[PDB]
RNA sequence: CGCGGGGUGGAGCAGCCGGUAGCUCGUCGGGCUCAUAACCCGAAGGUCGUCGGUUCAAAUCCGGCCCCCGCAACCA
RNA sequence: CGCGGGGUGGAGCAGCCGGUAGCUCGUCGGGCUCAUAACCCGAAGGUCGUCGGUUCAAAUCCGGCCCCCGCAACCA
RNA sequence: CUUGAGUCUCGUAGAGGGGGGUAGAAUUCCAGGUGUAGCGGUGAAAUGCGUAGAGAUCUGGAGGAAUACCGGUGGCGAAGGCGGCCCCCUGGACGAAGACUGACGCUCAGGUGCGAAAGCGUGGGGAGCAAACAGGAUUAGAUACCCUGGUAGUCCACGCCGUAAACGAUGUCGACUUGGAGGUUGUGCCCUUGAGGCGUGGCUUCCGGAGCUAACGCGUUAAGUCGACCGCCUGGGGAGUACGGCCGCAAGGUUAAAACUCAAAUGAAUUGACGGGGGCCCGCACAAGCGGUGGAGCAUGUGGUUUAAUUCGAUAACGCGA
RNA sequence: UGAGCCUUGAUGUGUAGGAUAGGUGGGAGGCUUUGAAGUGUGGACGCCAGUCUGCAUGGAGCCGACCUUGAAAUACCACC
């Protein structure tokens, strides 16, 4: 907004692992304020993922996230007659969010049956460095690279 | 703006110096001026207008200054 | 090809496009590169970054000649002016002289008419 | 009839040694875009005309056939 | 009468081999638009003048007829 | 007679004029070298130029036009205008003292001359720029703006044209009336003790007093206070046009009506509103996000059409009065 | 500057692999004081693994069927 920047609201860490990031992810996943179901789904995804990759539940998730975080995104300035997409260094708070969102989107897209399962699959893909979220990230990066002349 | 890098001089410093020299020359400005033909009248007008502006800045503003703002 | 230690970099910096040309000290061109050639078109090639990359390309091209010392001659107004020379420096030549060589007439030919935009 | 070019991904131009199997525009997805095009990324389209053989590499070298070219010569 | 162009979607200009059946403005539809002219998306309008035949491709090659053109020649 | 007007003496500054030389930078072209795939251009493109070697880069040559910096609300000129440097011919201005002439002055209808740019004639020249023209864009169209080219013309000589917002939109000459800050160019004195100090002349930029003015503003360079002479105006349109004359190669110029027609037309300033003017600021206004509507079926209101009637109203109206 | 030729040299990565296998026939040891393996490197090619070769140093050994393989050694060889 114009007038005043405001302090981001307080977020509680999830009961299972005691993590803020996890909680955020769960929130993102959630729909129609049905938090509980969403959190259950998330947990399920984690468990399966853990089983698959070993490690811990949280650590694996973190790793997955890491492979889909964008260093740089673009924005539309359009000062000229035609529009110029300009790259911008995307901040720590935002980058984490974006990756999560992308992952969620991928999960939603995916052709597997249960939501949780789909999510798990997505996570696995991210970890391995294939899939939808990763592709999206690449695209984002690619665009930035293309428009690197603007800065 | 001919320049020679001195012995044990940094590159950046040299570049800066060059830039300064260029500025002094007013080469870029000159180039800009000669990009397109300015009608004599237009040239005259700008010069006089600019002068007028300068005069305004010098005297009127000085007068204003005498009186405090708050 | 005969290797040469010292040469000139001519940097033709226009408003629309930068052209870097490395030559020997006598005048004979060794290699060249351009912002338009480096994979930039229109809005993109009239930028400092583009110029820099052109410069880099040029440098790469004159690797076989084995050029260590380099004097730079900068021509025209543009973005590709400071940037290009920086790029050249990075590429790793000892920059010896940095000259400006913009053609300034002493009121000679009539320029074209002013654009109405 | 004889003699020089050779025969391909919707069309076209594909790196002297047979192991590289394409690039442009095109159609679809997406990215950006006010737009459209340009621009970025990726994706479906083969026989290498054909019949064979020298060889694990063959369309990729050769024997014949069908055509496209080009040849220049002929015609009671 | 003889001889050259050919005959279409409300009008007009439609890719040498008969298998492609259009594009402009127009009317409707809806939001853009301070307003419409809009940009953009989609939608109704055929016979291919006609009578036949070579052929599964025909209006699309040919035989005749009706007109539109153009022809240049004629006229007691 | 000497105070106006002029002449003489010595200096002064000046893009004042005419003529003839020359210098350096840059553009263009030509010839050649190096070199290799782009160049160019725009908001974005394309036309255009490029592998027949462009663009870039260096060497040599040709030719034309204009004179960076100095350079300034600086200077000179009656105005138009005048800008590298040098020479030749040449007009004016100002100051310093004296000396002389002795009203010789001011203004000026007709008349005469000079008079930007474009334009015309004849002969030269032609680099760059560029009306016309052509193509490429843009667009509903684009006979424009933008891009790529491009011929008259711009340049020179000698003629003609005789007009421009030829403006300070302010005729010329003279006298008189408070001030300040400069610029420029002389000149007198003063220890120039220093770039200074005190004057006194010319031209000039800005601000402002009295006064003047419709106001805006002008204000010792008047638009103040007066005198001399001339030019010009008499509502807007029709019209600076027609006819006639004079001038012109022509383009056209100049002089200059009438009918008819409207009750306005204008100037300055004022309050608003508006601006694809400018500054500052705000709002789920955008941006950042989440969920919808627009497609489906149904509910519901409206438009329409239908009906004997489909009650009337709302149209920031349309699950609204209800 | 193009381009032939008597001649004597070099040149040749399907994967199995000692690793830059053109093919046929005569063949089990060719070269080494008109100087063998290891070292220093000047110039070439290149699929970056290496290959051929000049001059220096060194002075008494490297390479064979080999294990594999559609085809066996550049152990000598002539034909191209």
F223 C1' – A143 CA distance, angstroms?
70
Phi-psi region of C42 (alpha: psi -120 to 50; beta: other; left: phi over 0): left
The Cα angle at residue B56 between residues B54 and B62, in degrees rounded to 5: 110
Spatial neighbors of A129 by CB under 8 A, at least 6 apart, are A67
* Distance between CA atoms of residues B1 and B22, nearest Å: 6
- As a whole number of angstroms, the distance between CA C48 and CA A71 comes to 23
Residues in Cβ contact with A82 at an 8 Å cutoff, skipping those fewer than 6 apart: C43
**Chain C hits for B5, Cβ within 8 Å:** 95-98
* Distance between start and end Cα atoms, chain C: 51
Q: CB-based contact (8 Å) between A148 and chain C?
A: yes
Give the domain extent around C50. Answer: 1-117
CB A120 within 8 A of CB A64: no
| SS3 call for C13 | strand
Q: Is A82 on the interface with C (CB under 8 A)?
A: yes
Resolution (A): 8.9
Q: Read off the DSSP letter of residue A75.
A: E
Q: Which of residues 22-41 of C touch strand D (CB under 7 A)?
A: 39, 41
Closest-CA distance of chain C to residue A95, Å: 26
Radius of gyration of chain A (CA): 17
Q: Which nucleotide is nearest to A76 (CA to C1')?
A: D32
Residues sharing a CB contact under 8 Å with residue A138, sequence separation 6 or more, in sequence order? none
Subunit contact B36:C104, Cβ cutoff 8 A: no
Which residues from 78-107 of A have any strand D atom under 7 Å from their CB?
78, 81-83, 85
- Confirm or reject contact between B35 and chain C (CB < 8 A): yes
Sign of CA dihedral A55, A56, A60, A66: negative
Report how this structure was experimentally obtained.
Answer: cryo-EM
d(CA C73, CA C88): 12
Domains defined for chain A, CATH in brackets? 20-147 (1.10.455.10)
Distance CA A25, CA A23 (A): 5
């Amino acid at each position: 907004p114009r007038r005043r920047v405001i302090g981001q609201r307080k977020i509680l860490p999830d009961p299972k692992f005691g993590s803020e990031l996890l909680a955020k992810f769960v929130n993102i996943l959630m729909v129609d304020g049905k938090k509980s179901t969403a959190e259950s789904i998330v947990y399920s995804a984690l468990e399966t993922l853990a089983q698959r990759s070993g490690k811990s539940e949280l650590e694996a998730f973190e790793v997955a996230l890491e492979n889909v975080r964008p260093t740089v995104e673009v924005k539309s300035r359009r000062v000229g007659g035609s529009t110029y997409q300009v790259p911008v260094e995307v901040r720590p708070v935002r980058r984490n969010a974006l990756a999560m969102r992308w992952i969620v989107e991928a999960a939603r897209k995916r052709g597997d049956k249960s939501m949780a399962l789909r999510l798990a699959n997505e996570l696995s893909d991210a970890a391995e460095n294939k899939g939808t979220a990763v592709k999206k990230r690449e695209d984002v990066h690619r665009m930035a690279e293309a428009n690197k002349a603007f800065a | 703006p001919v320049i020679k890098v001195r012995e044990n001089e940094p590159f950046d410093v040299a570049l800066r110096r060059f830039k300064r020299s260029c500025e002094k020359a007013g080469v870029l400005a000159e180039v800009r001026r000669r990009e397109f033909y300015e009608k004599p009248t237009t040239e005259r007008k700008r010069a006089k207008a600019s002068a007028v502006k300068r005069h305004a800045k010098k005297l009127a503003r000085e007068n204003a200054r005498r009186t405090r703002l708050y | 090809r005969k290797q040469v230690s010292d040469g000139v970099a001519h940097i033709h910096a226009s408003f629309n496009n930068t052209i870097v040309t490395i030559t020997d000290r006598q005048g004979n061109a060794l290699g060249w590169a351009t912002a338009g050639g480096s994979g930039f078109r229109g809005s993109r090639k009239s930028t400092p970054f583009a110029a820099q990359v052109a410069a880099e390309r040029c440098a790469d091209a004159v690797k076989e000649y084995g050029i260590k010392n380099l004097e730079v001659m900068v021509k025209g107004p543009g973005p590709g002016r400071e940037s290009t020379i920086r790029a050249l420096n990075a590429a790793g030549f000892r920059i010896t002289n940095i000259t400006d060589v913009t053609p300034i007439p002493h009121n000679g030919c009539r320029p074209p008419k002013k654009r109405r935009v």
